[PDB]
Each structure stands twice: as C-alpha cells, then as structure tokens.
Symmetry: C5
Subunit: 237 residues, 5 copies
C-alpha cells in the first residue's frame, strides 16, 4: 500500500529575523567586520556548490515572519549540521534571530538516470522569487489519504501532476519529504520570476481533489532573490 521514494540532498530552510535595534547599536566598523566574516562563509559555501557537493541560496522574506531565508542542501545530515553550527557561530548570527526552520530530503515519489540526479541533487534556479510552505496529507474521518487504496491515490496524484506540468516554464518546484524529519510530511519550495504564479498554481491545486480533500498546510513564506549587492544593502543603515 505504502509509497516508496528515492531520496537525495538533505535540506535546511533557515528563517531569520534581523535584530535591527541591536545591529544599529553596533559601531559601523564592527558591522563591516561581521559582514566580511559572513562573506567568507558564503564564499566557502560557493566552493561546495561548484564542486557539486551541495547547493544554497538566500532570499529576503516579506512580512514579519523573517527578513531572510538561507536554503541549504548537503549530501548528509552531518554536513548539514556542520553548516548550521558554523553559521550560528558567525559573529553576525547573534543578530539573526531564529524564527522558523524546516528539515527535509529531496524526494522522488514512486506513484544514475541523469534525469533522476537532476531532480535528486537539484541545481537551484536563480529566479526572482521563492515561496516555501510545509504540508501534510489529512487523516481526518472520511478524508483519510493513508487509508485510501493505492489505485485511488495513484489516480489523485496523476491529476495533481497534470496541473503542475502546465506550470513548467513558469514555476520550478523542489519537493522535500520530511516524514521522520520535521513536523509536516513535505516541505514545498517554489521558484518563479512572477510571484503571482505561486498564487496561480497553489490556487489551481487547491481545487483538485488531491489537495481539496487531503492537503493540510502550514505557514507560507515568500521572498526575493538576494545576491551580494542586495545582501550588503539589506544590512546598511
């Protein structure tokens, strides 16, 4: 009955809110020193990306939930843990307050193939916007995904995939499985150059039976790509 999956990079979505009042009290020399240290840290992460042993990206997040998200991908939980711990020990991380995080593993569901590696070990597209949310499938009375027969679940998933293929080109998705790893069953990351495409795809999916009857959603987070020019601007008072 159970789904069986292929699993790739381990993923951390690390959401931070900048402690502006504390940062503002810092002398501008201390600020520059801490950003230089962060800049070294990110150069090291770019080395790891270039040799194909992981990926990362940063977006600035709208609203009070976070000021930015660091999305990091590594080939082991140990390498992910080490990134996280070294990040937290940067001087600047004292000003980056933790507001939410998500742990997952890139997931390919069964419902060396170079086209499988490309999904399991995803290169992150440098799209203008990111959208992140976690979700689970419902187990609530007669709306119970995990009691459905495989044939009915397969049909529901087929219909859901038709919708998403129509947003190919517009929206790129990474699906992280998180059963056993975090509080929901998947972490969904979308990338697009038009944020309204996130609204469009997620709305269209909500009226398809697989989500209409069986999806449970967490919080949603949207943001704008942060390269270095925008990163240094972010922190300049």
């Amino acid at each position: 009955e159970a789904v069986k999956t292929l699993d790739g990079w381990f993923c951390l979505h690390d959401f931070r809110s900048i402690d502006w009042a504390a940062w503002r009290e810092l002398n501008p020399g201390n600020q520059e020193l801490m950003l230089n240290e962060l800049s070294h840290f990110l150069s090291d992460m770019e080395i790891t990306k270039n040799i194909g042993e992981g990926e990362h990206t940063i977006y600035s997040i709208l609203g009070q939930k976070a000021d930015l998200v660091f999305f990091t991908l590594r080939d082991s939980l140990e390498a992910l843990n080490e990134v996280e711990n070294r990040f937290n020990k940067l001087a600047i991380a004292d000003y980056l307050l933790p507001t939410y995080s998500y742990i997952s593993v890139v997931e390919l569901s069964n419902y060396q193939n170079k086209g499988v590696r490309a999904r399991l070990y995803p290169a992150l597209p440098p799209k203008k916007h990111i959208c992140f949310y976690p979700m689970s499938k419902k187990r609530d009375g007669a709306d119970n995904w995990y009691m459905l027969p495989m044939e009915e679940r397969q049909q529901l998933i087929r219909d859901h995939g038709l919708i998403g293929r129509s947003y190919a080109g517009k929206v790129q998705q990474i699906i992280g499985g998180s059963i056993g790893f975090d509080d929901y069953e998947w972490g969904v990351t979308l990338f697009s150059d038009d944020a309204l495409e996130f609204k469009r795809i997620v709305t269209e999916m909500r009226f398809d039976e697989a989500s209409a009857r069986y999806a449970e959603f967490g919080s949603f987070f949207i943001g704008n790509l942060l390269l270095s020019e925008q990163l240094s601007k972010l922190f300049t008072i």
Copy 2:
C-alpha cells in the same frame, strides 16, 4: 477553479510601541526620530502621488497592536524595500512587530467585472480603480484574514463552480447593501501568507463592521465555509494624531 485579476501587493504591518524604552529618550532625540519618520512618510506620499502605490496608518485598539501601517505597491521588490527601509528607521526600534499580513488586491471571476470580449480588463478604468485602490480616509479600519473550509461535508474547494458562484453571488448582495457605509479591499493570499484572503474594511461608523460581518455570518458562504483569524480594529491617524500619540 477560480481565476483572478491581481493588483497591488499589500503589507499590513502591525506594531506595538515600547513605551518604556521611548520614555528613556530625551525629547530632543525623540523629535529627531519623529522627524526621520515624517521624511519617510513624505517619501511614501510621493510614491502614492506618482501612482505607484498607496499607504495609510491607523491606531489599533487593545494590546494586539498600537499601530498598523498598511502599504500597497506595484511589486514585491518595492514592498520589500519599503519594509526594510522602515525597519531601519531609528524609531522602528520602538515599534515592536506583533503581526503582519501579505496579500495582493484580488478580483475573482465568480462574477463579471467588465463586458466580456477580447478587450483586456487591465485597460478598463473601472477595473483598475478596484485593482489599484485609492484608500479612503474613513475614521475606522477593520482587518482580519480568512480561509474557506475544507472540512468533511463543508468543503468549499470540492464544490462545483456553479455552486460556488451562487454562494458568492448571495454574499455579494449583502455586501452591496452596505454601499456608502463600508468599503472593502479583498487581498488574495493563497501562496503568500497563512490564510487565503486578507479582508480590510473601512467605515466612518465602527458599528457597521459588526453589522456587515454579523449579517454575512448568517449567509451560507460564511456560515458554512468561513474560517477566521484574528480581528483588528482601529482609528485613522494623520500627522496631528501621530506626534500626539508619541508625546509621553
């Protein structure tokens, strides 16, 4: 599935004033920080006057917040830039974040907003007035997020289109009967925030908020399918009310 037209991107930014810290500042430094906020708001008025957005400020009742800054912009980048420049104001260290909401002004296709045809609605001036709304200087504001239920036999997203259309139609008749008393902005937020809409109401009589929201609650579209978040109520704040608000 519903199709939407989408207009300005919206931020409702709720803040609580840290009176104890503010009180520790001498009045010289308080004036300097208020001067910097006025310059900031003057810049926001320029953006409004060139047609690139809108904004307004209300004082909020109760402990949820002291102020809401409601800002509308033509891109997420611009909205993000307002937010970030605002947090970097000196006075913002005394404006503690207590809640926020991201949405986009939305017109659905459940009913018609313009004569059908090849003519695209974004060129219709009546449609544009609704997608890119002028904010009215009404005495009061009411904000709350909401979603439509997906709960056993009460599942909005499993209804056929013609049934959702009828429910929305009937909801709209109620709303139309508050013309000239309540003005509404509906921001869609599927994909953007934690509920599916952010609802902003404006009225000169706060009791009209209770009236319409109560009346709609006995209409099937809300009685059976609405799920509500927190409600925020407040009073219009112009310059006079603002320097006054911060005089301790």
Copy 3:
C-alpha cells in the same frame, strides 16, 4: 438585530515585581500618585455619565489586574488606553491579554439605557471569558432557522433569570472587533455563583451544542486601599 451601547476594553496586566522592587520608595510613591490622578480622571468621566470603569485583582498567573473600561466611542477608548500606557507605572504593568467589544442588546428608554450603558456594580468578584457559537458540521448555529435559534436563546434566558440577585452579566458583542463573538463579564459577591451559572448553562442546548469558550479570568474587587496594598513591597 442588536442595539449597541458603550465600547468596552478589558485590559489584563501582570506586574513586573522584579523591576518594581528596584525602585526606591519615593519614586514608587510618585508613580502611584500619578496613577491615582489618572483613576480620579476616570471617575470624573463616570460621574458625568460618559463611561464606566472598574479594577479587579486576578487570580493565577494570567494577570495580576484587569482594568475594565467603557466609553461612548472607539476614539475615547483608544485615548484612555494610550494615556494609560504613558503613565510611568504602566512600564511595570505588562500586557497579558485584552478584549474589545460593544455592549449588546438583541434608545430613548431608561431600562434599555440602563442595559446599554451599564453601571458597574461594586461586587466582590468578577468573571470574564469570551465565546463564539460553533459552525461545526451538524452543530452550526449560523445555519439554524430563525425560529430554532429563538427557542434556544429563550431557554438560556430562563436560567439567567433564576440567578437574579446572585449574578449580574454584561454581554459585549465583538464580531468585527475581536477574535471571538462575545465578551461575557459576570459580577457576584459569591464566586461560586460563577461556577453554578456557567455549569447550568453548559447543560442547556444553546451552550451544550453551540458554545465555544476562550480563557476564563476570575478576580476580586480592588478599591484604592487594596490598590496601595497590592503595590507595597
């Protein structure tokens, strides 16, 4: 259809004893003097008929105090709240919960005016809780026909009548104003009457099937003398 009266704020505060303790007694006195001035201001509004207010000490950790204020506009209620937060002593009164509502009765009449603009009785104890009516499957209050709801509300009223002289109730409507649909304040000289009336109502179908409750707060009347004792440390 409802008639609406004074706008209401329930403002719950926990006292920051650690910081209050750090103040020398002279500065404590100055802050209490300012607070007494503010409260005498509130009493003036009461005595001219433009509002009401009362203060109860709250049991348990949810709060030390509740300030229950009633005013004739949202602007006036907002001004009181803001002037309150600007008192020096308010820096030691940490906000832990609040509720906004309007006195509700479903205007030239004296007994109606007495309901819509209620005098606050100096009863020994207070009980506050918000509530809503369920919209949950077959237990959906707002999908009931008019005549069924009327019968359900009728029966709940008979229970209330039996507590005349034991419990006095103020019902604030809060649809559009706060997170629940009503704020319920009860006053009695015997706190056990709160438990009795609220239990009795819970077995009545209007509440048994359709009530959804928030947190409950219970307290003892604070006059000027008990206020000075509260803060003596």
Copy 4:
C-alpha cells in the same frame, strides 16, 4: 449540582538559575530566610484549619516547582499569591503555568466525612500528578447533551475504577467551570508514580473518558520538604 470546599491554586515556577547564580551566598541566604518565614506563616494557616499547602519538584522543563495552596476564600488565596510574588526570591521563580479551581463534590457540610473531602488534608506522598481536563462537546460525543441517567451511569463506572486504586492513589478533584480554562483540575498523590500511569490508562479505556475526556498538559513531581528545598537552591 456540587458541594464546594477550599479554593485552590496550582502555581508552577521555573528557577532562573543564571540569575540566582549571580547572587552572592549571603544574599541567597537572606532570600531563602524570607521564604522560610513565609512558609512558616503558611504552616500556621494549615495548623489552624484555614487552608493547606504543599510543594513538589516537577520533572522536565515545564517547571522546577509547584506550589499547591488551598484557602477558604478567593481573597485569602489572592493574598497568598501576591505576598509570594513580592518575596525577593520570587524574582528568580518564573511563572510557567497556573490553575485555579475549587474542591468539588458532585451528587452524581456538617458531616465529618464530607468535610474531610471538601477541606482535604494533603497526604505527604512521594509523588504528585496534576492535569486539567474538560468533557467533550463534539458531534455525537457530547457529554452535556447526554440524559442525566446516562451520565449517572458513566460516572458510576468511572468511580468503580477509582475505588480499586484505594490505598494507592489519593485524588483531589477541583471544579474550574467559571474559574479557569478547563472544567476540572485533577491532582493525584501516590508513593508509586507508576500508579498514575496505571489509573489514568485504565480510566482512558472506560467510556466516560474514552469518549468524553479532553486533557490538558500533565505535570509530575516529587515531594519537597525543608531538607530538599534548601538543596534544590544550593548551586
């Protein structure tokens, strides 16, 4: 319809070890001496029959301690709480949970057995368990819509289970409708903490709880007398 006895406060605190550690030992001793005089005053009220109190250390992060106090009026209880909060040492006792209730005897004052239950002597048992609970009002599982006779029978069967733990678990049931966020506060005392797991598990398979009980958080701890109270605070 119920009989109601002492009003009850369960006051849960976590100790601010970092701040406590900054105090020099003479000041630490002065604050503990003040707490000693406060507790000896509480012992007078206990000795004269006007209330009760006990202290347990609580396992896990929810709390380090619970102060469980019973008084014959809400005013007396409020006065205990406020005086406690104004102790110097209370700055180091951070509030993490509390519960207000009244000792309750349903029908599902001059009598000596009734009085022993309404105004209960607290047993010096090694362990305490506290949790609040309410009865469900959820579709077909609605306690408050049940006929009186059906409720009577469900309570009867529940009481039979409780009777079988006589001599192992002693219970205080506090009614809290109108007073706090659930409908009852449940306090269990036993010298064997596994008896808590046993009695609460067995009740959960009895219809009265299986269908109708809604539980809050659970707290368990160990009796703190004077000997253990000083050691708790010694760094």
Copy 5:
C-alpha cells in the same frame, strides 16, 4: 473495554537545549574551558551510573532551530531523574543551554503481544524482558524523537475499540517494525500520566533515511493511518566527547 496492561522500566528524560551563542561568545577562553571541564565531570558521573547498570544516557546534536542538543537520560526512579536534571541545570554551562522542549516517559512493554512464555515466571526475572525495559543505548549515528497519542475522535476512537481489535492493529504494526530489524532500533516510552502525549518514541539508526522509510510505511498501516496523532519530530547526529568540544569552539 479491557485496558492495556504494561511492564515499565527506566524513567526517561528527553532534554532539548538551544545554545546561547551570543552569550557564550562573550566568555573568555579560560572561563569557557572551566565550564567545559565541569561539564565533562558531570558527564563522567553519568557514565559511572551507566557502568554500574543504574541508568543510561546519550547526547545527539539536533538539526534545525528546535534545538542544538538533546540529552536523553534514563534512570531507575523519578527521584534520580529529577536529581540529574537539577544538577545539570546548576552547571555553569547550563546558563548557555536554553530549554526548548522536554519529554518525560517510562520504558514500556504492553501486553498486546507476549514478551515471554506464560509459564508462571516473574517477567522481571526474564533477562530478555530486562534487556527491553532497561535498554542499552546503541551508538547509532542518528536519533529520531517524536511523541504521539491515539485518537479519540468520532468513529476513529482507539480507546473504544475491543481488546482483540486493538491487538490485531498492534500485531500488524509490529510486523512492519519487525521488518526494520537491524536497521532501526526503537524505544517506546509510555507517558500517560507523565507528559502531554501518550508515548514518546525514540528511533536509532545509522541511516537517517530509515527513519523516513519506517515512519512512512507505518503511516499506511491502519494502526497509525487511522489512530495516530503526532507531535513534533526531532532528528540528530551522535555527539561524543570530541564532537562536543568542537560544537562549543568558536
């Protein structure tokens, strides 16, 4: 109707902590060392209790913001467990270890299935049973923790089911778990009466993906599909003395 009966072993604490890096950064290295020396002395005291058979303990670093560390401690009484917790909080370094979550439970063996022959013997004298009630912790690379309860929700009410139906559901769940022998080791802590859910579940494995595999497969089995209510999930990596010193080096 017929309640489950259990055998109960060591009392357990899962103690999750987040490191206050900002504060720790402000200490000079000599004072950091003294605090780590004192911690190493406390852990060697824990090791002594392990080596005389009166408890167990282990430390994992936790991924994500929920915690940096979990200290999982097992002891033969609630008093001993409470004494360990209190001595830990009074370490100097514990000021830098902020509490983010905890769980209290007791190693549980229920009677849904047999754990030993019904020949009249004291189960607590059966060494196989003792190995389960007083479990040696395996030094597996990864840990997974989550609490859970069984639903009492309308037609999905575990506690209204007949004994023989619950036994069938537990039996089927066990066959799935049996298939992960050698890949995932489980400790089930019962927590009815002790904490906010009904069990705390700890999984150990050298491959973190086996956690996802077993939890997913059980979620399609009726016992969980229909009746499980889950809390938060925590996953982590084994921390020995060496990885601990690195964790705290800035």
